[PDB]
Amino acid sequence: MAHHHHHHVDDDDKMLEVLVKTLDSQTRTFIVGAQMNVKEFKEHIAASVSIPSEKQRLIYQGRVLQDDKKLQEYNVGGKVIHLVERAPPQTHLPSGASSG
């Protein structure tokens, strides 16, 4: 922020230390807010995990966490999520022109 000076604290319970594993070898952090993105968050981590948000599937507690909601819905502050790679959804997404 730099020179905000309007209640230096605000997050407190917010601001997650998003831990996220990829398969086994890795485990990387994606520190964000509690309720900040998840959507745009996934878009951001896409390259770091080599998994684009469109295929990318965040699983924690067997729950399918995605860009559809917020991070605090999954409450992943300080827990490693599990990333996975699925089979191509070409039958699910017809017409592979737009972002295909």
Partner: protein
Amino acid sequence: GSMAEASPHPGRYFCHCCSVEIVPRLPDYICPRCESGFIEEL
């Protein structure tokens, strides 16, 4: 789904590490096949 209308029954998980369907060990959400928690409930 067809079985259990709008009721998520945990007999259907999928661990992508095994690339085979599992019935996890919930307390941890581990896979029974490899005990890696890369399981999503289907």
